[PDB]
């Protein structure tokens, strides 16, 4: 009953990161990628999810595929 809720790296604990479409697939099968909250709320606009849990967390360079987010001096 789950598919692949594992321990989100780009944000960090509490937030899960799921992928769907990255196992299965052709070699450029396009992997959709799905993140839950520790409350419930399931988000997949990335930076839905990013204004979601609050200036704890930000998603505006994060790949929402690759699980990664860059940051070139946020001044």
Do not use: H, N
Not at 13 to 32: I, L, M, N, Q, Y
Request: glycine residues 10%; positive net charge.
């Amino acid at each position: 009953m789950a598919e692949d809720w594992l321990d989100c790296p780009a944000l960090g604990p509490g937030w899960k990161r799921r992928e769907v479409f990255r196992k299965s697939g052709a070699t450029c099968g396009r992997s959709d990628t799905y993140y839950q909250s520790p409350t419930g709320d399931r988000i997949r606009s990335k930076v839905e999810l990013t204004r979601y849990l609050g200036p704890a967390c930000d998603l505006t360079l994060f790949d929402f595929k690759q699980g990664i987010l860059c940051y070139p001096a946020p001044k």
